[PDB]
Amino acid sequence: ILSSIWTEGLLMCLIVSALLLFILIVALSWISNLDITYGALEKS
Amino acid sequence: CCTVLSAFGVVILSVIAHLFNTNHESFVGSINDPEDGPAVAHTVYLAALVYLVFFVFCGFQ
Amino acid sequence: FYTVVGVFIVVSAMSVLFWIMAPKNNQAVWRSTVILTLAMMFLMWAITFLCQLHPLVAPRRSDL
Amino acid sequence: FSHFLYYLVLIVVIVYGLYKLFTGHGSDINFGKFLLRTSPYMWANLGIALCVGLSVVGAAWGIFITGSSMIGAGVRAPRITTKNLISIIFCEVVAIYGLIIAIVFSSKLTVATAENMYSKSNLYTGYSLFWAGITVGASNLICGIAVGITGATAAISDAADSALFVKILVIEIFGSILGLLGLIVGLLMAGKASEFQ
Amino acid sequence: AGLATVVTFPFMFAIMFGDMGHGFILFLMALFLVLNERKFGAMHRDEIFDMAFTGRYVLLLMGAFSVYTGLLYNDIFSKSMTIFKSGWQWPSTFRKGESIEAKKTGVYPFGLDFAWHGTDNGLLFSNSYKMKLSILMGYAHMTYSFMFSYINYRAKNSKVDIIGNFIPGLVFMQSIFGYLSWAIVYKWSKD
Amino acid sequence: LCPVYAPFFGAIGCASAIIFTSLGAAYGTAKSGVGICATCVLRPDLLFKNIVPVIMAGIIAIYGLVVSVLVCYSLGQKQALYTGFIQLGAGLSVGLSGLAAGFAIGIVGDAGVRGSSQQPRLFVGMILILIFAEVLGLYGLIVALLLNSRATQ
Amino acid sequence: ELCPVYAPFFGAIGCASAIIFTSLGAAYGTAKSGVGICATCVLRPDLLFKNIVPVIMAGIIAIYGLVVSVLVCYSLGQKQALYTGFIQLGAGLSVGLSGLAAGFAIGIVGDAGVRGSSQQPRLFVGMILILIFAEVLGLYGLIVALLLNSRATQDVVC
Amino acid sequence: ELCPVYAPFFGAIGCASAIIFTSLGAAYGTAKSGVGICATCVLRPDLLFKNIVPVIMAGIIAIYGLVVSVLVCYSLGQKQALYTGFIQLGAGLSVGLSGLAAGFAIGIVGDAGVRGSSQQPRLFVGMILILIFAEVLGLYGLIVALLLNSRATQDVVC
Amino acid sequence: ELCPVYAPFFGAIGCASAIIFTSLGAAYGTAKSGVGICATCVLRPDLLFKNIVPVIMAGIIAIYGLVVSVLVCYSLGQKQALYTGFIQLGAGLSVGLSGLAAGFAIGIVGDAGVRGSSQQPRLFVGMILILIFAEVLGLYGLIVALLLNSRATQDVV
Amino acid sequence: TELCPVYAPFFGAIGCASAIIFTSLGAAYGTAKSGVGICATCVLRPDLLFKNIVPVIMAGIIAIYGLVVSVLVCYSLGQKQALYTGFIQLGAGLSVGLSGLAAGFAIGIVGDAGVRGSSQQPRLFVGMILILIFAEVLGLYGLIVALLLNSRATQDVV
């Protein structure tokens, strides 16, 4: 057996849910860096 | 500069072909070395002649 | 080891014989080049001879 | 804060490895048994999905790099906006590379019998599809980004002078060698891999 | 300091550059400039070739010592020279592919021995030899150039500088690293 | 052969197939809607022809919705790891592809609707660029709908 | 028990590291100094071949890594001791992460040296001397790894 | 148990660290002070062989690392105590991560000293004075590592 | 069980860490004070040997590590208790990460005081008076580790 | 045993170390940041120099708070001590350390801002002392918490 706590199925759920959470953190850091061009909305 | 490389190709490959012909143990003496001495000497001596052709042709330049 | 001392004798006697028979034109570079080069040639010969006089490691190979 | 987590995970890995090693149980951190006992369908499906995902995230990357500068450079010189679309096309072909490799890989994806499930061949064709999906998706990612950069420079040098686009299209050709080489290597890697049996 | 340099700089070069093949190439391309020094003297030299032709006699010595030291090593384009009689004999009857040792017959006359070439532990022996070689030649170079300080303070007629710098320097250097260089030779002397 | 943790990968694939696709569609709607709002304060008659990038970003999210619905009709309590990881692959494919295609449509769309108000010949240019970025979601949808057909066989 | 099956992993990554980090340092030393060469030989074209000595000086670092990695490669075995893998890992790190240091030093010294040597002709000898003091770090790493690699397979057993 | 199989790992990464972390501090002391020599001797090139003392004192700590790496290297064996591996790791870290500090200090002090010794020539004797304190930090680590390495194989058993 | 095989690990890490972090603190305290000196006496070089006090007080807190990394080194055995290794690790950290703080404080106060003491001549007494409070930090860490190391082998079995 | 294992003095040694480490970090910040303000506001007003050293004395009291608890945890360590003893010695060490660290941050920031503006207005000297008292009772509270945890370290232990 691989382990009793860190079994064959838990340890490859925590790789899938680490890849997906990595893609999520990257995509949320893309959307967090999204700013509005305010000079093209004002009168000045 | 091809005549210098060709003169060294005469000298070095002629000495290597002679050391393969006489079964010198720095070239044949190991298991990973080639088994037949003069079989390698026959194809190194022809390369020595090829570099001698290059040395004679580039010696008239 | 006495075949290192026996070579030191014939190198040192040669260097002393060249110290007194150096040419007078360029003395401080005749008896400085030739006497120092004999010293360094003897030093590398003595070092490469004494490392093999009584060796601790034997040569070991598989492919022969 | 991310450097704090990078240091914390490193400290926890070192403390766990040295605790497991000092107590005579250091072979319990067993990466080989982890590779032997995880399912080959994980590696196969993950390789297929990351192939077609990372080809597209490089294709779409290059598309905006040489699209936004094409539209910016086309304001004064609008005679580039159709000729220079081959720079979109060269960074778009790296997605069809990953697509036609992902379908060829998914053809090797059948139901293996449970009695021979963690066999030699079934585990081989999980490993091969995983790394041959990675080496195609990452190569098409990097190729799409490189072709997008060398197309964004071409879209502005085209609007500068018309005779420069022909000279800088060659750099896009040498940049688009890379996705085709990844296309070749990912087919050679899963060339001897059989189906799941 | 450029009168002891005239031998020691090509020789300390040759200890690092030890090969009869590369050394003969460097000696040959130096002797090409030495024999043609009249046609090259009345010539405009650019900076790299002015550097190479200003030192056409540093390179002749750097080749001539490199041939000597690469004849001390067995290193002719990284090959051995079976010139002398070996101090090691190999066993005559042995199985193919097994690891064998050599029995010491004598000592090799001039230079390093050629039975260390295709050898598994030959590089350990070359490490020991070249490390102790570097230690002894650095000791010799330092204790030779340290006597010139005494000759300087004697020509200046300053016994205060002698007793303050040369003697406490001499019996500090020789009592530690002179003892190390003696101990290397004495370990080589014993069996 | 069909473990107890096997519908984790299918449920998280059904999750990610709409999560990553909606993140990409939200970037493509927001960043290209900033360009619409910035463009149409000085030339407001281009408002309903500049609306194409947010429509294409919506088509991306529809492509992700299709895969999420088609994965959640094949989930069961006692499915194999084969079905679970093939639903995971069908989720990851359309997730990364819709995310990439939405990022590309967002970054191309605001630049396109800004160049279209200065040069009128750039409308066909931005449409022809955005069509290449639209079908990348199709390129992940193909792998998702092919891995869906191999779910229970 | 003493020569395990996972034992050539450490020797393999030691053979890898002596190319990886050494070529990374040599690449830094060639790139950052070549920026200075190409930036100063705009108005000083005759100093174009005197300024290559930082780039050659950084290439000798990669030659140092090449030699030690080949000499480790010709001692990797299937039935290899774990001591031998540990020694080869140490000898790979000792060349790699010291040649990276020497490459950083040559890359930061050499561009400033070719920027100042175009303005002052007597600064060239000082640049060469500082580059010798910077290259001797990678030389020290090679000395440590050649003294270390010679001890792998001396008294190994089982 | 008392001399396990993984015991030469700590000795190998203590032989490696004593030149890695030493040479990447010596490289900082060479580079950061060499960009201060090459930027100063464009106007005062007569001070070129006098301002190079920070580079020499940064090269001395790499020799301090080399000595300890050789002495840890020649005490490695296949069957050595785990105490010996712990002591050699401690000696390697004590040289490396303190010669790194000494190199940082020599690098930061040396360019500040050579850029200031050309405006005021009476600051050179102050630069040497600060730089001896910056350079003895690696000598302290060498003393600690030699006192460790003398304790490595003294009363070891099994 | 009380004296395991992995017990000298913590003692060796403590013996290293006693001098490693004090060398880092002393390096910071020497580096910033040396920049302050070399930037403050290109105009008034008469204050060269006067302003050397921050460099000396930063060099003392490395001798503070050199003391305890010898007193821990001469109590390292193969068969030593795990309690001894724990105390030697605590002593090495107690000198190291306190002399690192003392070196940070000496390095900031040193250049802030030698760049200002070229203007006001009687800021030198205040600089010494603040650097004493910055150097008793390393002295306190030395006291803590010398009280630990006098207990690492007191009643061990 | 079970209530008193072998790894139990680890937490006690970490609690003896941290109580002086983090208070030395806090006291060092409170000395350095508030000594910049002393050395900056003395070049124009040197007569208030022995009264502007209040924020370095009040910061050095934090180090004495760490020293007292480090001495008291040091004189309670034993080889066969309880795991509860090591746990609440770690608790006492963290309670002094990570609160004296915060007290040192507050003393440094407040003392810098107070001796920067006390040279301008002489009536702010009675104000910055009253704020530094509230900044120093933060470490006095951690001293009280650790002296109450240390009175229970070996009280009803078995």
Added chain:
Amino acid sequence: LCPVYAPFFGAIGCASAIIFTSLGAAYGTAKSGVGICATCVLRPDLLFKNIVPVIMAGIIAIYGLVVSVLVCYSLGQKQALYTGFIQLGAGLSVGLSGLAAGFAIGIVGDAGVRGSSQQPRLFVGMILILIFAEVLGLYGLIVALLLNSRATQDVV
């Protein structure tokens, strides 16, 4: 049910009750002290009127001190794991809420004493906002007291 590693959570709950409230009080004292020492250079008469954000910061550390003393006097060697978990929760409840209350008191106090010298009527608004910022730590005090009242209630 009452294991050996059970007072670890109680010791961390006794530490974290005073550690994070002292961090919050230290942020509040630092921000408010920078505010006071920059607004009372020109207006020294209202120096002792502006020390109220620093007092509101110190009451947060008093809140942490009370919970840490009450958790300290309920520790034991042979206590339950439930008691250790409740003491950890009661330490974190007062600590990481007094940290937030200290952040709010520091920001509001700095912004209020920098503008209360210009407008004298802003003082009764600053006091009113700091009451809402100090009730944020009073809530964590109430949660910590109600947890610690049940740490040893029905415990075997």
Added chain:
Amino acid sequence: NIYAPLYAPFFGFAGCAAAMVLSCLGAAIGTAKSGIGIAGIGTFKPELIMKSLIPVVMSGILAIYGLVVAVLIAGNLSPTEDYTLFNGFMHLSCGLCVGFACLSSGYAIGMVGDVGVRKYMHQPRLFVGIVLILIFSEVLGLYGMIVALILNTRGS
């Protein structure tokens, strides 16, 4: 067979992927960063562009360096033949020592051959030195490919 376990092709296909991905990453950095410098001088003296395509070609050779070793690792991988873990570790190392070799060589070619091409529009005598520094920075990947080929022939 205890020397040829069934997880050994993981490290061989990892060698394939590390030989291809990092070498085409280095080739892409080397062609993109240098194409930036080639297109930057597109207006100022356009006649020096077709002569300056050498750091693009020498960058593209770095992908051939990874292609050769990726083909030679993938040719030694079959599900029917025995495949030792020694062979897998060796293929991992020979892909890993060519991938970062070509990555560093591509970074060096990209940083050299855009600054050189970008300064070459001022001085037309730079070109020999530019080609020379590109050769010195392109043999960096040839060293790694030599190590990878020797290591492949050793490990099989």
